[PDB]
Amino acid sequence: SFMNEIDNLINDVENDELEFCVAPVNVPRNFIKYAQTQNKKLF
């Protein structure tokens, strides 16, 4: 509801399968590449 939206706005307290999530990093397009610098077991 609009009430909960404004309440979350003032309080500063803020998912379908086919939607694709991305990192909040500065450049998400290279994010995986940055992660490939950290490790390679996951990738």
């Binding site: 009430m3 003032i10 086919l18 939607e19 999530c21 991305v22 397009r29």
Partner: protein, 119 residues
């Protein structure tokens, strides 16, 4: 989550525009900061008002701003939006978004009405 939502739309390549390099990730650069230059300021203002005075003030402000903004011309010819300037109290102020200009190309007027208000 992000990046719109696939729905088997089948119309991925248009004859009006091409996809951006970032699609909709919206990587933080100077244009991204300048895009959210007015939304953040009014978020701060609504935070101040509905905090100190009560969230009903923010409710009244948002409904008044939407009502006066709803009173505007159709997409195409630019709308003066004087009543919005009175309500948001920016008529006294002249700012970078008032002056300067962007010249704007391939979309017919009917596609703009479909895109603006979902018809």
């Amino acid at each position: 989550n992000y990046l719109e939502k696939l729905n088997f739309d089948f119309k991925v390549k248009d004859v009006v525009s091409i996809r951006d390099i970032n699609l909709e990730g919206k990587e933080k650069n100077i244009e991204t900061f300048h895009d959210t230059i007015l939304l953040n300021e009014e978020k701060n203002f609504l935070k101040r008002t509905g905090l100190i005075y009560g969230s009903q003030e923010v409710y009244k402000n948002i409904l008044d701003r939407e009502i006066v903004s709803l009173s505007r011309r159709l997409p195409g010819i630019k709308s003066s939006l004087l009543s919005l300037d009175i309500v948001r109290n920016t008529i006294d102020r002249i700012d970078s978004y008032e002056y300067m200009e962007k010249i704007d190309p391939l979309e017919p007027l009917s596609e703009i009405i479909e895109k603006k208000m979902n018809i």
